[PDB]
Structure of Peptidyl-prolyl cis-trans isomerase A:
Amino acid sequence: VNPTVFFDIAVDGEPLGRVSFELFADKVPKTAENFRALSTGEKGFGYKGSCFHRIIPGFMCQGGDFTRHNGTGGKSIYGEKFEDENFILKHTGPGILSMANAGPNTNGSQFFICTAKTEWLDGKHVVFGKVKEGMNIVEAMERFGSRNGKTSKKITIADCGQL
Ligand SMILES: COC(=O)[C@@H]1CCCN(C(=O)[C@H](Cc2cccc(O)c2)NC(=O)[C@@H](NC(C)=O)C(C)C)N1
């Protein structure tokens, strides 16, 4: 029952590959549904064409700011922000998909994909999914990051949807 969504990643416009995610709607249905709908675009906005604005090798890839493209924007399907649904799931290692935020109960559309175990974020960021196929593509994206997170090539979600 858990939805599978995919991102087709491009690097300076050149196709790199596909990442697919399992969304844990059985544990975090509201958070899963937000990401699922932003990945299909069915509400009229979402992730297609957006970029990954911060990539830190050995930590995480951050994206989902489809309104300001720099970490300051994005919005949920429910409004600007929604609650931390729960913290049942933990940041157990690479491939974990979790919500970025600016404080308690401020989820929008920004998310991050862990490339390492990030247990210090447990209880503060809502984990809602995990990479299914294409962790090697996330590892490839990682190489275009830097210590301060600035990317050396433009990493975009060229296409996305539900599988
Ligand atoms: C260098 O680390 C980050 O940039 C982190 C990685 C996880 C996702 N994330 C956020 O949720 C960060 C908070 C954070 C968490 C952990 C470490 C940090 O330095 C900063 N938040 C943001 O980027 C948001 N808010 C602000 C005020 O920056 C944006 C979603 C509207 N950014």
In short: The CA atoms of residues 9 and 17 lie 6 Å apart.
